[model samples]
Target: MVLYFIGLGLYDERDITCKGLEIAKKCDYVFAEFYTSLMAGTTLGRIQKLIGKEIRVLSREDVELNFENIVLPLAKENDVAFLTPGDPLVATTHAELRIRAKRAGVESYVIHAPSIYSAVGITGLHIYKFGKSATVAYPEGNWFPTSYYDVIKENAERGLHTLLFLDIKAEKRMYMTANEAMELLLKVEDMKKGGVFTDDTLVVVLARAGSLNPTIRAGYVKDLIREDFGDPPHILIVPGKLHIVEAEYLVEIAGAPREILRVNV
Candidate 1:
């Protein structure tokens, strides 16, 4: 009869809010899916230990293919907990599952957590300036998508920033880094001629956010393309015309060079 949609926040199991932790312990069954976005700093064993429950980890197929049959059946009379990385509903897969269960007379209440969108202040970019967010998926054999290029184009032309979520193969433990994302964008530029991303394009790399020491570096695509932003789960942003105060934070605080102070107007 009761379902709690809990977000384990970003990073470790301890990052969960007190409210989430208390209710999670009260749950009869705790279910989670690291496939949406793995907790870069944690493991299922650690999470289960904290919750004091044998957490049943869901795969992408289970959530998308059989959520109705698997999770909904248990939630009918049980106090169930469904956990995701960062914010609960921020991931589309998680949201779809919620709706499907709600259709089956399931009542789910969402518990919020720290999100990459809200935590983007680490880059010193004006949060209000973010226009649209898009994902940079890997180019597969048959499908070569470049819609992200137009997304950046549309946002930049409107003087708004674009937030690019990197791709990940959760089961394989493969994650797309900022450098790989940069390479993909440059490759897209050559074919699409969008001119949105190039050698001199100013961008921000936010890696391992919600950690005490997140890597927030801002520079041209050329310089940052080779620099390591630590391990796994990186976010890239293409800034549009920045306000004076924001640029100051990038240079003095975010390791962005002096040249940006002059031009990124």
Candidate 2:
């Protein structure tokens, strides 16, 4: 008996890896959790049909708190598959689940799939130039948070790009847009008196990352702030410094204006 950690990739049911799909189909029990990241093009029903199994979806508390109680018992007696949105363990503390599996006397395996961490290369930015990533969270009442601003500021100081993940509440059905994140960053700058996010700061918006017709736009915050970047599942990138070729791709492919594109030698 063994436990499998499988990733469902970025977009739809078809985005799962071939090995992951086959392994999932062979499992005796399948459990899935989607709160970390939601796929833009698929539903739970579609995934159930694809794997030909009845998947019992787990909530945050169920998986994080009671995983040892519910999922581990089955893995001891059966071949169990635990599925997650995007690459497993990338978004959550699920890595420790394997340790639990080991103590429970069940073998564990991981099957990789496409994640937004690599998919951001579509923005014409060099993959190696990306620095630390931070999330852009919405403030709740007096609980305003701006630590992400410092992440962007520090990465920019080192001439490395920052990938900003927008806030998401899959259970609440609430998603933060790129426009809202940019506006929030600007507000944080105003409050802190930091020149981190200004009107002229160049930013890139990538929406519906895994889809074929994803929206990729790059421009100054002053111009791209109000522009619509399709629906939810949006991510914002603040490039520190760009190569000349990177600027050209942004202008030609990402709908960026040539006049506003900036690059260093």
Candidate 3:
């Protein structure tokens, strides 16, 4: 019996690939992981209706605390599928599960599908030009981290793009807005006395990627804070020195402001 790590793409049940659907049908049990990111419009019931299979969802604590007693034992007994939104491996915890399954002598198969990481390529930014992607986490007490800012700064120094994943709590249905994320980055720049991400830094906000009402906007960091990007599941892209083609596309296609259209330094 094989344990499948299935990717359910972005958005909803319709976004799941044919191959992923086929695998889900063959599995004796489907366990979905929803903590990393969520499909705002889709639920387990909706997904089950579309794929014609019942899927049980595992909470963050359930999988983290009780994986050995719950998930692994099932894998060894029957063909099982662990479903995740976007891509299965994007969350490091899922990767650890893969290793754990291997130790249990459970054969694991990863079925690839569309994910936010691949969807970002539609912005015309070269994928290889991207450095390590980082998440902007919620502030603890009065303290906030600018380590993500450093990642962007270091990526810019190397002339590579930076993809910032805004933090969220899926179970609570809470998501960090792109505007809030912009404000956080601006604050980091101000406190660090850094010239890397200035108020004038060109940033792109991609909202609801892989959805019907997907939105992409480009502007200065400060300006972005003033604008409203409707809905959830958003991401920010900090382009490191941009190419002329990328500049034109962001301006013409993404409705990026003309003033922010100049080539990145």
Candidate 4:
């Protein structure tokens, strides 16, 4: 008996690696969850057709609270696979699921795939120049989360780019866009009064990565907060001090202003 954690890459059903697809097809049972991130280019039916498995979808509560009760027991008797968008482990609590498998004496393995962690390469920013990453989340009731703002602040002080993952509520079909993320940061700035986020701040937006025409835009918050970048599954970048080459890429490839080469580089 074996358990597999497989990644379904970034945008669609076709993004699943060949190895991941092969292993998923051989599994006795398959499960998936979409709350963490979504493949904006494809549907669950499409993914199921490609893997040739009837995937039992799990909710956040089902996976987080009942994985041991429901999924692992089956793994003890049959080959089981759990699928997730992007890399199986990135920005997800699935790591704890692996630990659960160990405690239950079920052997588990991970099959890697392309994740936004590396997909940001399309932005032409140096991968190593990125600093600590954060996610922008929705505030509920009187509770407002602002920790992501501080992350961008700290990274900018060190001249390292900050990668911001946008929020999503899959059950409600709500995916936060880059524009909404900027507005939230602007609200946080009003409260904290930190110069971390403002209209004039330079930022980058990436939408629908893993697609040939994925939207990649770089500009100030003032200009971008109102511009539409197409669709959901958006990501934001708060750049620190830029190298000249980085500036050129943003300008020539991402359509950022040429003045950024002097002002931000």
Model 1, 1-265: lDDT tens digits are 8788899998888889899999999999888988988898888999999999999998889888998888888899899999989988998757777788779999989999888888898888888899989999999999999888899999999999999999999999999889999999999999988788999999999888888988889989999999988887899999998898989999998899989989896
User: Model 4, range 1-265, lDDT digits (tens) per residue?
Assistant: 7999999999989999999999999999999988888888999999999998999999899999999988999999999999999998885578989999999999999999999999998998999999999999988999999999999999999999999998888888889889889999999999999999999899999988998889999999999999999978899999999999999999999999988988998
Model 2 per-residue lDDT tens digits across residues 136-164: 98999899999999999999999999999
The ten-residue window of minimal lDDT in model 3 covers 256-265
What local lDDT does model 3 show for residue 118? 85
Off by over 4 Å in 4: none
Off by over 4 Å in 2: 261-265
Decide which is better by lDDT, 1 or 3: 1
lDDT of each: 0.90, 0.91, 0.84, 0.93
The TM-score, computed over Cα atoms with residue i paired to residue i, of candidate 1 is: 0.97
In model 3, where do residues sit more than 4 Å from their true spots?
Answer: 261-265
| Clash pairs detected, candidate 3 | none
Q: Which ten residues in a row have the lowest lDDT in candidate 1?
A: 92-101
TM-score computed on alpha carbons, candidate 4: 0.97
Model 3 TM = 0.95
Better of 2 and 3 by lDDT: 2
Provide C-alpha RMSD values for all models, in order.
Answer: 1.1, 1.2, 1.5, 1.0
